[PDB]
Amino acid sequence: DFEEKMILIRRTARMQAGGRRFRFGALVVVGDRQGRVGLGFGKAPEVPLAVQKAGYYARRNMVEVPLQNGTIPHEIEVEFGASKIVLKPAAPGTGVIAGAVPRAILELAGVTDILTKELGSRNPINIAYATMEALRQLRTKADVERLRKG
Amino acid sequence: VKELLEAGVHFGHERKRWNPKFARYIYAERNGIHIIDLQKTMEELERTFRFIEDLAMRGGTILFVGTKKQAQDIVRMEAERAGMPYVNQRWLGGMLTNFKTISQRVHRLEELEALFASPEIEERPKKEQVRLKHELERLQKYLSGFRLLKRLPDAIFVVDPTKEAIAVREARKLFIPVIALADTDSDPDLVDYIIPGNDDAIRSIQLILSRAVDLIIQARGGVVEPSPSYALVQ
């Protein structure tokens, strides 16, 4: 059990002789605020269901966010295909400045100080994936020089 | 004793249908065939066993997989001869990755296993008898060895990893350690513990399945003679 905030829900649809059917989708983030965050996309014949599935994959696919003073170790850009993201660490006592997606994630990421910017496609979904893969790709003075042993 | 064994008739396979990643594992191309370097297969058969041993003796089960007619039976043996889960038939997908559910088919084998020996058969029209029978038949056909442990195998041993790569994927997506006997036909990189050698002629298959299932029980006690292999073996 973690935080579990729900990024967005959408009613998609497909055609077929007679009429149009539907389906709902769910981006959901999840966190303890100790540096453990999870993103999950859930689609199901019903709104309630979808969100359920959301948390489930979320709890399945999470990542260690190497905080520091409540912020982030270093700065990063990440393109996920079309949608880019800027993560830049802020001094103690700034605030988490980002759009619904990158914040909603970064909040339960346990961050507080972090400058950010969406770029390229601002597709929620695709920004989401960006935000994670960004995080994932974070390093600390530690695990850095850990690779520069010899 | 190993050198003379393998080198005897159990090395060098696939030719020019290769895959460049399998380079550090080759001596040359004789008469067209790719002849793997055996001297390294030792150093690798070693480390592999180093892993088997340090698992056999820590009481963790190993899933065996082979679906090719050149190596099906010779695994159904070494598996029963180790009392380990195995897969002889069509390695159905998601068996590991979607365990909870494929398992529900096992709980259907025993749903019929117990409604085999029973007085409920005095009834059931000739319809359900042909049906429920057939249903147990195939259930069995594919799940003879996929019962054993109702838990995620601590690792998996496999013949041609490029053949049942589907499997390898499942294991890989679950972090389940993977050992397998791959040749040039197979890409090394994606195998945790690597057995570089023939993957078709029943020769090399028995030689590495044997001494693998042999080194299995040699961490439980009960050293025996080799297992059923020759019956029409060439």
């Binding site: 170790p73 270093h74 020089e145 690779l147 042993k149 010899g150 | 890989r172 972090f175 994606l190 945790d192």
Partner: protein, 138 residues
């Protein structure tokens, strides 16, 4: 005909590692040395030796990568994830010492030539100098 031999090297390197490879051989030069002599001194390579391929003097450069990995795509993390040249041949970039970049928040290096040798972001700041910001690595 190679316009900027370095951004070549720099790329040779970059390219070799994407597939993870023993070494690779930038054609040699005292400056390509000097630069390499810092990737290694800073722990991005194992190092490098001088070699030959038909009287032609290159630089065997031994790459460094991470530990294997569990899960799918067990391919190692990179010791050199990112390496992109600055101060290019079609647009030299220079810098005063106060103008010197603070790569990746300390986690990175900004190699750069100067009048007192090919320093680094810290080496320059400390030595109190600037010059042709050669490239950024991390």
């Amino acid at each position: 005909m190679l316009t900027d031999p370095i951004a070549d090297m720099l790329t040779r390197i970059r390219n070799a590692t994407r597939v993870y490879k023993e070494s690779t051989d930038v054609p040699a030069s005292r400056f390509k040395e000097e630069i390499l002599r810092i990737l290694a001194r800073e722990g991005f390579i194992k190092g490098y030796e001088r070699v030959d391929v038909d009287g032609k003097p290159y630089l065997r450069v031994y790459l460094k990568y991470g530990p294997r990995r569990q899960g799918p795509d067990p391919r190692p993390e990179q010791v050199i994830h990112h390496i992109r040249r600055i101060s290019k041949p079609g647009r030299r970039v220079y810098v005063g010492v106060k103008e010197i970049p603070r790569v990746r928040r300390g986690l990175g290096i900004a190699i750069l030539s100067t009048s007192k040798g090919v320093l680094t972001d810290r080496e320059a700041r400390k030595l109190g100098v600037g010059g042709e910001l050669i490239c950024e690595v991390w």
